[PDB]
Amino acid sequence: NPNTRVMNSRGIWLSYVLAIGLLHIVLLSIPFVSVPVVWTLTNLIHNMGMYIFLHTVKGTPFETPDQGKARLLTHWEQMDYGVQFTASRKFLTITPIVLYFLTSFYTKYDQIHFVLNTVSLMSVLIPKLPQLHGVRIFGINKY
Amino acid sequence: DLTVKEKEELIEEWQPEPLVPPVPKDHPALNYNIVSGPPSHKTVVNGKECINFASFNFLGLLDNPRVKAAALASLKKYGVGTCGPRGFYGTFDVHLDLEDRLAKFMKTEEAIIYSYGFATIASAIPAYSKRGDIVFVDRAACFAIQKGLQASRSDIKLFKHNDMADLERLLKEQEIEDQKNPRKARVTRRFIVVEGLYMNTGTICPLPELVKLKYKYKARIFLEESLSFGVLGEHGRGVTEHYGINIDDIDLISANMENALASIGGFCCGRSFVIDHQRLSGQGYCFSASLPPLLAAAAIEALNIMEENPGIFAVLKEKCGQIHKALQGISGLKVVGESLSPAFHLQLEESTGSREQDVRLLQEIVDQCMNRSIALTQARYLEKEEKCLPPPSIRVVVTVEQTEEELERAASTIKEVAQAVLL
Amino acid sequence: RAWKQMSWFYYQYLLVTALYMLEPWERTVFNSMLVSIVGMALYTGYVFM
Amino acid sequence: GLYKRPFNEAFEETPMLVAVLTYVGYGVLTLFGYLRDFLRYWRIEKCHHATEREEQKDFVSLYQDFENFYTRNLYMRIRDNWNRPICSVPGARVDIMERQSHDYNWSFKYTGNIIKGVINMGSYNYLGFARNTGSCQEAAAKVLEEYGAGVCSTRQEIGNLDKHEELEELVARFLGVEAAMAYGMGFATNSMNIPALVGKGCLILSDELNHASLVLGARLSGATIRIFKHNNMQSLEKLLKDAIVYGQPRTRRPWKKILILVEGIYSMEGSIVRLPEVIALKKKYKAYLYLDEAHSIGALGPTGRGVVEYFGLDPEDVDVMMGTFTKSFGASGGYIGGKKELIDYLRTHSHSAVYATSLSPPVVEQIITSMKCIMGQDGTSLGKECVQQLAENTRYFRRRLKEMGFIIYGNEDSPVVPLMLYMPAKIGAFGREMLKRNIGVVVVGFPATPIIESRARFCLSAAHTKEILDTALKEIDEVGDLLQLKYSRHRL
Numbered sequence A: 001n002p003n004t005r006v007m008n009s010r011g012i013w014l015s016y017v018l019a020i021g022l023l024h025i026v027l028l029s030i031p032f033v034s035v036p037v038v039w040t041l042t043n044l045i046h047n048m049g050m051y052i053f054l055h056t057v058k059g060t061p062f063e064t065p066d067q068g069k070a071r072l073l074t075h076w077e078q079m080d081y082g083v084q085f086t087a088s089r090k091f092l093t094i095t096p097i098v099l100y101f102l103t104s105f106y107t108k109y110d111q112i113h114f115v116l117n118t119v120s121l122m123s124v125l126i127p128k129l130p131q132l133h134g135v136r137i138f139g140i141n142k143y
Numbered sequence B: 001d002l003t004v005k006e007k008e009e010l011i012e013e014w015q016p017e018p019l020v021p022p023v024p025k026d027h028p029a030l031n032y033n034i035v036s037g038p039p040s041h042k043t044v045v046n047g048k049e050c051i052n053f054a055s056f057n058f059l060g061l062l063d064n065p066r067v068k069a070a071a072l073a074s075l076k077k078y079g080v081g082t083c084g085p086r087g088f089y090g091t092f093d094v095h096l097d098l099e100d101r102l103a104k105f106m107k108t109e110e111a112i113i114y115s116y117g118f119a120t121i122a123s124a125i126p127a128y129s130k131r132g133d134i135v136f137v138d139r140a141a142c143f144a145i146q147k148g149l150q151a152s153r154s155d156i157k158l159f160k161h162n163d164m165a166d167l168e169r170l171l172k173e174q175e176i177e178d179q180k181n182p183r184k185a186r187v188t189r190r191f192i193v194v195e196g197l198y199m200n201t202g203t204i205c206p207l208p209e210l211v212k213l214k215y216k217y218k219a220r221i222f223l224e225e226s227l228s229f230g231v232l233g234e235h236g237r238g239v240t241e242h243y244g245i246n247i248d249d250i251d252l253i254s255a256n257m258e259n260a261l262a263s264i265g266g267f268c269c270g271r272s273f274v275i276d277h278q279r280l281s282g283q284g285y286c287f288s289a290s291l292p293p294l295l296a297a298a299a300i301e302a303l304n305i306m307e308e309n310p311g312i313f314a315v316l317k318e319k320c321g322q323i324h325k326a327l328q329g330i331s332g333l334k335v336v337g338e339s340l341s342p343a344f345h346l347q348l349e350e351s352t353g354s355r356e357q358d359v360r361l362l363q364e365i366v367d368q369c370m371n372r373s374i375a376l377t378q379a380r381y382l383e384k385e386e387k388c389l390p391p392p393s394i395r396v397v398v399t400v401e402q403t404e405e406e407l408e409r410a411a412s413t414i415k416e417v418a419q420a421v422l423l
Numbered sequence C: 001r002a003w004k005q006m007s008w009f010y011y012q013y014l015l016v017t018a019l020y021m022l023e024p025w026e027r028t029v030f031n032s033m034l035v036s037i038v039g040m041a042l043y044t045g046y047v048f049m
Numbered sequence D: 001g002l003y004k005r006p007f008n009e010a011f012e013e014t015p016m017l018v019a020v021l022t023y024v025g026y027g028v029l030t031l032f033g034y035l036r037d038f039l040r041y042w043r044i045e046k047c048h049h050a051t052e053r054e055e056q057k058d059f060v061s062l063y064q065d066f067e068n069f070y071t072r073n074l075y076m077r078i079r080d081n082w083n084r085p086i087c088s089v090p091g092a093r094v095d096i097m098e099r100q101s102h103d104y105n106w107s108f109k110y111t112g113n114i115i116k117g118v119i120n121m122g123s124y125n126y127l128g129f130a131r132n133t134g135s136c137q138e139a140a141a142k143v144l145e146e147y148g149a150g151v152c153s154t155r156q157e158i159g160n161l162d163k164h165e166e167l168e169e170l171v172a173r174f175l176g177v178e179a180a181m182a183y184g185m186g187f188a189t190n191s192m193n194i195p196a197l198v199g200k201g202c203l204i205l206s207d208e209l210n211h212a213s214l215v216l217g218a219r220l221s222g223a224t225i226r227i228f229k230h231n232n233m234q235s236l237e238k239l240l241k242d243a244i245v246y247g248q249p250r251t252r253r254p255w256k257k258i259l260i261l262v263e264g265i266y267s268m269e270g271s272i273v274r275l276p277e278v279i280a281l282k283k284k285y286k287a288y289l290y291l292d293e294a295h296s297i298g299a300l301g302p303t304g305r306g307v308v309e310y311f312g313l314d315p316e317d318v319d320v321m322m323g324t325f326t327k328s329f330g331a332s333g334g335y336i337g338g339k340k341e342l343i344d345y346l347r348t349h350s351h352s353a354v355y356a357t358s359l360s361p362p363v364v365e366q367i368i369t370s371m372k373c374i375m376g377q378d379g380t381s382l383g384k385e386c387v388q389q390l391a392e393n394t395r396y397f398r399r400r401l402k403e404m405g406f407i408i409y410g411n412e413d414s415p416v417v418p419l420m421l422y423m424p425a426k427i428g429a430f431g432r433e434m435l436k437r438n439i440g441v442v443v444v445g446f447p448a449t450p451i452i453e454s455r456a457r458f459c460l461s462a463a464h465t466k467e468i469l470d471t472a473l474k475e476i477d478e479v480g481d482l483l484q485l486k487y488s489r490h491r492l
């Protein structure tokens, strides 16, 4: 199952970091948007994209020869064949916290941005817990 | 954790089993039959000349001169080896032509060619079925179907042989299990796997009732016609032609060309939607060398001969009926099969306690028959691996080149030999 | 003249960014988005300096 | 583990920029695939893909859409590289039927033109036994006339012939083992003889990059399967120690058997297995060895007995010696060799021997003639010049590719030469540009390779003269200049 090892390959981490940097630059490119709102939009878009591509879309784009072990499993549970802690998983859990710290730094610590940013960070963070593995809240996206 | 010294002791004291267990059983299968010359009608076996009643060569196309000439021309043009898979410069023009001929012969959109008779169905089954799906398979399916089903980790639910009420009961229970949990029922695929003409028992499946059940309970049908591809129907198109069922109602038809066409390989025919997927998801197709062009040309010429003259099916039918009616009446053997079946079985009526003694009795009958110049064989199975083990039996196979007098003499010889042995 | 060098450079651009495989209208869509992004970035950068 | 001749191999790491650009390309392709799927969903654009017949719309959909995503968008765009029909003997030069597509590779129409004289880097024919003339062809024709094409029953019942017995005895003499057996297809050989040996309660240590057939055979039997790193002897030793010490997973009971599946030459990576160390480990830890010599039966070795001759070892050490006739000898089929007791047990209990049709007579005669030619029994020096020419060809070709600056994998003796492309679009670009310059090659992707390493395979042969190699090398040099494929940092 190659999909398991794609996050372990060479250059994936640097590609991810460059992608986030490019996303922030393109957000900066818009003329009228002010800086704290730029940072908030960067954080929100990054968290929503990470959530969609990790915990919502399940299965494998390519057909798999193990007769569909990962049929019901999302990418996060698919990573490293269920091993809870690894370098890639630690890095993926670490990075959004750093992004939120930076965003709250460049947004001057206002409440209105803080509530949205905290909600986004919690949304992306809760599925990462090893305790929350293979469970769907209220049975949504179960099948 | 363990000390290092304990690790050395544990590694040192371990002693494994032998790679292969000893075979002290005087296993009869260890004594192969040695055939001198072609395995055709009027062959030679073990140094004795015999009339061939054992080889699955129904139409007698093994030694037809036109087939040999076509194969020779293909040999002189292409060579023997294909030197690659179907993906990597291994596809020839003869392969495409053969696929087209098969598709036009079965009145179907697309057909696919496999280089081995077992691999075709054993790789077609797991291509479409994955884990979590349900498959309702007949109890007496051949070994290839069983290995194919085991390859796909889906759920298997056997049902009694040619018992349609039993399949209906199983389907109703599955309907209840779907009623309990709709979410899973939205994702679970249902298949029904059957054989056109069963090899183990020599009976024919009830296709119309199967079609009605498919359209009622929504389960896709897979048909395996290894034995009925070139023997059943007026035009010899299979069991669908025999019953009158339209070819579209069946999702996939698989058959090996070893038996009727007398050349190596198999094929699967169906609508383009289902067939196009095997070219990528068929393990026997992607990761294996293509069929040599020689055998492909032999198959093409066999198809031309089959299409030109369709009276061979009629003469085969009359011969099968005659031998089935002649063999009835033996002292201590029962005939298992239907009149229209080319290959059927002879089994014991009164079975002794052990199976190995029944095998020895049948081998006695076979040997004493072969000493009278009728070559017969015995059905061979793997006792440990077979899911449902059929009783031991002598296999009788009918062919177009056998005359009427040879059939009468075979019946009389078998009857007298059996009445001598069993009594 | 310079046309051959520029044609080679555009070939390399298509090869690297996987635009080679795509149908002609997909290339047009991608190029339009890219040039729009560059234009807005340049204008927002220069207006301030 | 004594290496009597130096063991050299090279697996260069991917440069960072190439990896980053590979990921960028794959991401763009995935996004446009999603956009195409969304456009097709609302019936904005009609789908060329075949659809369900109308009165089967209520049934659960046969395929999950996401499963075919990679096929629908990634694969279909460059489909014209694969499945190229040929209309001649697959020798050094092959004739390809030219085809074109008007709907972007969904449907293909054959034009009248036939591309003649294509240099054939795709077909195996390592020793160049793929010809339509010679003594092999005449012998095959004679046996075809005498026996007919095909046999109509399994080996155990009536399908055993005298030709099969002659072939089995000849193979037994050829390898050096006591006994051997032959099967119709190599894939069948693996997938039908692995389950007979090991059952539930045994451990199968399998290489990471093993062929699909070996994996299928391991899965069919109930044995537990564990995977070690590709040619990492430390990893293999660690797995063996742990397996013997701890035992079966649920109930810590001693294993019945431990079987090691390895290959003589890995087709994709092109590396030769480290056989002496594997045999030393097998002896020390009381395991059994299953050696798959599909790609190395003819190519490797001074006299072509296989990898075991290449290392100068003793064939009685390997417990099971599998092999295939397709790659070198120029005919389909497979074989398994070993001690006499193993072969008796296989003849009794193999799935193929019971439920599968025997091997065709003309094919076995072609195999017999080719083997007699290699063994020096033909009376001519044609079985020796083949091996010498193959060795020199591989040396020259590998050295020249390394001098120009590409990235080449594998051992320095391996005939199969994988060249690295590393990018998705460059695969199709390389295939189309190469065939345009009158050389046919093969390129591979996900169903055989990982994501970063997408490669093109050259299969050298003894049929290739020097002039053919010179022209092919010049055209590869020009294409590499054109497509910027010279990634190697050391020598360029």
Ligand SMILES: CCCCCCC(=O)CCCCCC/C=C/C[C@@H](O)[C@H](O)[C@](CO)(NCc1c(COP(=O)(O)O)cnc(C)c1O)C(=O)O
Binding pocket: B084, B085, B087, B088, B286, B287, B288, B289, B290, D074, D075, D078, D082, D185, D186, D187, D188, D211, D213, D263, D267, D292, D294, D295, D324, D325, D326, D327, D332, D333, D334, D424, D427, D443, D444, D445, D446, D447, D448
């Ligand atoms: C971004 C877009 C990417 C698209 C790429 C998609 C793609 O690559 C599709 C590929 C289409 C066809 C794939 C063919 C795969 C071949 C694998 C190869 O290893 C074969 O298995 C060979 C030759 O068949 N194996 C021979 C072999 C056997 C079986 O031999 P036979 O019984 O004679 O057929 C058994 N064991 C072993 C070890 C081998 O090698 C091969 O090795 O070339």
